[PDB]
Amino acid sequence: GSRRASVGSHRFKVYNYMSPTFCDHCGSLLWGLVKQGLKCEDCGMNVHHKCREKVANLCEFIVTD
Amino acid sequence: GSRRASVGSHRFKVYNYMSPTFCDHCGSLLWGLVKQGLKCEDCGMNVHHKCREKVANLCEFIVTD
Ligand SMILES: [Zn+2]
Ligand SMILES: [Zn+2]
Ligand SMILES: [Zn+2]
Ligand SMILES: [Zn+2]
Incomplete structure (x- = not known):
């Protein structure tokens, strides 16, 4: 069996962090x-x-839907 | 002398074409x-x-502003 993952490359967009955040x-x-x-x-x-x-381009996350 | 060019990587987004378009x-x-x-x-x-x-990731265009 397997998880389902969404697999692609990152899609970075400038963001306004509302609290101190690290790279x-x-x-x-x-x-x-x-x-x-x-x-x-x-x-x-x-x-x-x-x-x-x-960073590596690889972008994956588990689709927990 | 140098053109001003915007130089980065492509930012592809799914697009809904309205007329016949080629790759x-x-x-x-x-x-x-x-x-x-x-x-x-x-x-x-x-x-x-x-x-x-x-396609190569390189994405450049001349800035004609
Ligand atoms: Zn990502
Ligand atoms: Zn950093
Ligand atoms: Zn491009
Ligand atoms: Zn094609």
Whole structure:
């Protein structure tokens, strides 16, 4: 048997974090109070702009519907 | 002297074409009457779903602003 996963590549979009949030790639704070980084519209990964260049494209999440 | 170019990776989104449109990668018609393919939100490239993985990610266009 298997889980069902949605599989593709990340779809990052600038996001306004309402509380202090860290980069899921490098571990440093997403600096500032607005537009601090990007959140993947599909899986929720949060990254610095500069870290968008560093993460693997692979984007998967379990469809728990 | 240098053109100003916007340089990134493609941002493909499923698109509902209103008139017969060809794949910018392979040259075959984007078949169907809805969701026939994907259009890059940045540069306008049109591709079949199956051709998305065949094209280079590089996405550039001249900024004529
Ligand atoms: Zn993702
Ligand atoms: Zn980072
Ligand atoms: Zn493009
Ligand atoms: Zn094609």
